[PDB]
Amino acid sequence: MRTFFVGGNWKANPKTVEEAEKLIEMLNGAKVEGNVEVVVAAPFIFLPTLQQKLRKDWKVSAENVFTTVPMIKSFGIEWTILGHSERRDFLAAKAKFALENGMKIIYCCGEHLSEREAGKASEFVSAQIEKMIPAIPAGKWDDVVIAYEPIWAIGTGKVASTQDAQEMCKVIRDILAAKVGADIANKVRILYGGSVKPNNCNELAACPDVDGFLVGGASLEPGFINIVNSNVHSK
Amino acid sequence: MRTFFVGGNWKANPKTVEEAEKLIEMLNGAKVEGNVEVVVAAPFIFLPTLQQKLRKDWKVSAENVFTTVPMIKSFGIEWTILGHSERRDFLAAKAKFALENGMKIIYCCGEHLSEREAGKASEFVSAQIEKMIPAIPAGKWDDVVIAYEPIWAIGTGKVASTQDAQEMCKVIRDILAAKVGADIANKVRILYGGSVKPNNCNELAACPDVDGFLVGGASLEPGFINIVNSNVHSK
Ligand code: NA
Ligand code: NA
């Protein structure tokens, strides 16, 4: 049922409009296998370039928005990321706002090392999602994707396993089922936003509650297409 | 000696790329009188449009930068604003950085209502400038403009007088003279960044230590050209 979803988040890269154009030419020639929804998020100064030049079967995303949405929409940009850990290091209201204004969102959550070490990851993440849930207007869940970022495994010297991804995506789906029902839970894509590379994307994709990825550094490399194509391993 | 300087800061406006293009067409037809250096700062998503379409005798500025500079430079953008009150509501280091990386900066300062009411405006502003001063590399003062923002008069129900502008720009020039010498003090443009409109720009321009303006809302209106042309009243 759920279409696999892969978002490439360039973060604050590349350093120049010439490199961005070379990256776009590479993406435009990529052969996508299977069935997958691809979105690419880029720095604001590069959005008009992406929007003009990126293959039209993929969509462009902002990496964040402000309390602005009309400017981005005036370029024809439909998506934004919200809540990404770098920004985090309010949100339910900003989700409500972006959605009321016709945006599709990638809503990020995830716990830090102390909560993970304390055995409280599931509690901490559940609470984040329980706060998001009232802020989604009726009829807007089709326009929501949730990304789990294991912030505890980013720059800490700790690594996340494939089972950690699966467990945390299941936690999220279960809290959706508990609070807004099985139909919404069954349709919402829940992404893994930890370190995703060509060497682990296929095993992660196969996890039953992992519907895709919010990709960091590999989104600037030819390996992105391997990650996009890992959808063929997700059932 | 010092060339009058007017920076138009669009802030988070206009709401759409179509309106930005209409504003640029208006600016491109404007007849500038006298001698004046004009810079226009715009949201990041609109910088490539400004850079392509704005009259080449004016320059485009970023409204802020991050600890990025290469991206902006790759479009050929030479300026940025730093320290603007909205952003404020670290900096000396970011000034050093932007300058070392070839940027020209508009460095903002200014005190809040409590300091103004307490009689401490001059002390407060002086301290801000004394912090900026060590962070300017030797030989980079030609690439620095300072803007005084009377933050105490923005959204507080208090208004600033022409004499308040003059007094506060003089304070800044005096601290430059005291700390880095009369030659640098005599050449640095010090701008007034309070409410500047066609009805008060000429009287402000005539103030001896006011070298120009960092314009807010009037920068989106045909009145901007009146403010640019107030340079003929500055001696
Ligand atoms: Na899966
Ligand atoms: Na003057």
Side-chain angles (χ1 to χ4, degrees), chain A residues 2-14 16-21 23-24 26-30 32-55 57-65 68-85 88 91-95 97-130 132-157 159-162 164-202 204-234, chain B residues 2-14 16-21 23-24 26-30 32-55 57-65 68-85 88 91-95 97-130 132-157 159-162 164-202 204-234:
Chain A
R2 296 181 296 270
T3 296
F4 205 80
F5 183 104
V6 174
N9 177 15
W10 292 2
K11 301 174 179 203
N13 306 94
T16 70
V17 64
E18 305 80 352
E19 294 165 76
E21 287 183 9
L23 173 50
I24 292 161
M26 174 189 97
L27 297 170
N28 284 350
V32 176
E33 303 289 336
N35 188 32
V36 54
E37 177 167 8
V38 186
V39 173
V40 176
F44 292 109
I45 200 167
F46 295 149
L47 292 177
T49 290
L50 213 48
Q51 181 60 27
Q52 179 186 21
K53 301 189 166 82
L54 186 68
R55 49 193 298 167
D57 59 335
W58 291 5
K59 293 292 185 177
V60 176
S61 180
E63 292 181 357
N64 184 36
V65 292
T68 74
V69 172
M71 297 175 195
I72 277 156
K73 277 166 72 63
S74 77
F75 283 96
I77 290 156
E78 303 175 34
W79 285 88
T80 186
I81 298 174
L82 298 178
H84 180 81
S85 57
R88 289 185 184 251
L91 267 155
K94 174 180 278 178
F97 182 72
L99 289 167
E100 286 177 348
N101 280 273
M103 305 295 298
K104 298 175 170 203
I105 66 181
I106 298 159
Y107 189 92
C108 299
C109 61
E111 87 280 14
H112 294 75
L113 191 52
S114 65
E115 277 62 56
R116 165 64 52 161
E117 292 189 330
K120 292 160 69 181
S122 158
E123 296 81 329
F124 183 88
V125 172
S126 299
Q128 295 186 296
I129 295 300
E130 282 171 330
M132 172 206 67
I133 288 173
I136 312 300
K140 281 309 168 82
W141 279 104
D142 290 316
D143 289 347
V144 178
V145 167
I146 296 169
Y148 170 67
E149 309 192 302
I151 293 163
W152 64 268
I154 292 158
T156 57
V159 298
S161 66
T162 304
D164 292 326
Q166 165 59 28
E167 292 174 10
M168 293 310 288
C169 293
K170 179 52 174 167
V171 163
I172 294 167
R173 202 174 301 285
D174 282 349
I175 183 82
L176 297 175
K179 300 291 181 171
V180 291
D183 297 349
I184 284 148
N186 278 326
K187 79 184 188 186
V188 173
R189 280 81 58 84
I190 299 171
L191 315 182
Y192 177 66
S195 177
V196 183
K197 292 172 176 267
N199 60 11
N200 65 355
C201 52
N202 292 344
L204 286 159
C207 292
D209 290 277
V210 174
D211 298 316
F213 301 115
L214 180 61
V215 181
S219 75
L220 302 167
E221 308 171 344
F224 184 64
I225 187 59
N226 295 74
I227 296 166
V228 165
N229 286 344
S230 64
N231 76 82
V232 302
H233 299 282
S234 182
Chain B
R2 296 181 296 270
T3 296
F4 205 80
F5 183 104
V6 174
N9 177 15
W10 292 2
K11 301 174 179 203
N13 306 94
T16 70
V17 64
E18 305 80 352
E19 294 165 76
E21 287 183 9
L23 173 50
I24 292 161
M26 174 189 97
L27 297 170
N28 284 350
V32 176
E33 303 289 336
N35 188 32
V36 54
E37 177 167 8
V38 186
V39 173
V40 176
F44 292 109
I45 200 167
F46 295 149
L47 292 177
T49 290
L50 213 48
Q51 181 60 27
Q52 179 186 21
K53 301 189 166 82
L54 186 68
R55 49 193 298 167
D57 59 335
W58 291 5
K59 293 292 185 177
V60 176
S61 180
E63 292 181 357
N64 184 36
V65 292
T68 74
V69 172
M71 297 175 195
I72 277 156
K73 277 166 72 63
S74 77
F75 283 96
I77 290 156
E78 303 175 34
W79 285 88
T80 186
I81 298 174
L82 298 178
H84 180 81
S85 57
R88 289 185 184 251
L91 267 155
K94 174 180 278 178
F97 182 72
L99 289 167
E100 286 177 348
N101 280 273
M103 305 295 298
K104 298 175 170 203
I105 66 181
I106 298 159
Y107 189 92
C108 299
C109 61
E111 87 280 14
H112 294 75
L113 191 52
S114 65
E115 277 62 56
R116 165 64 52 161
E117 292 189 330
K120 292 160 69 181
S122 158
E123 296 81 329
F124 183 88
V125 172
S126 299
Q128 295 186 296
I129 295 300
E130 282 171 330
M132 172 206 67
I133 288 173
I136 312 300
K140 281 309 168 82
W141 279 104
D142 290 316
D143 289 347
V144 178
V145 167
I146 296 169
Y148 170 67
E149 309 192 302
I151 293 163
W152 64 268
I154 292 158
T156 57
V159 298
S161 66
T162 304
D164 292 326
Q166 165 59 28
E167 292 174 10
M168 293 310 288
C169 293
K170 179 52 174 167
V171 163
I172 294 167
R173 202 174 301 285
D174 282 349
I175 183 82
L176 297 175
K179 300 291 181 171
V180 291
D183 297 349
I184 284 148
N186 278 326
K187 79 184 188 186
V188 173
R189 280 81 58 84
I190 299 171
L191 315 182
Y192 177 66
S195 177
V196 183
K197 292 172 176 267
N199 60 11
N200 65 355
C201 52
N202 292 344
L204 286 159
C207 292
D209 290 277
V210 174
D211 298 316
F213 301 115
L214 180 61
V215 181
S219 75
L220 302 167
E221 308 171 344
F224 184 64
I225 187 59
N226 295 74
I227 296 166
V228 165
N229 286 344
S230 64
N231 76 82
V232 302
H233 299 282
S234 182

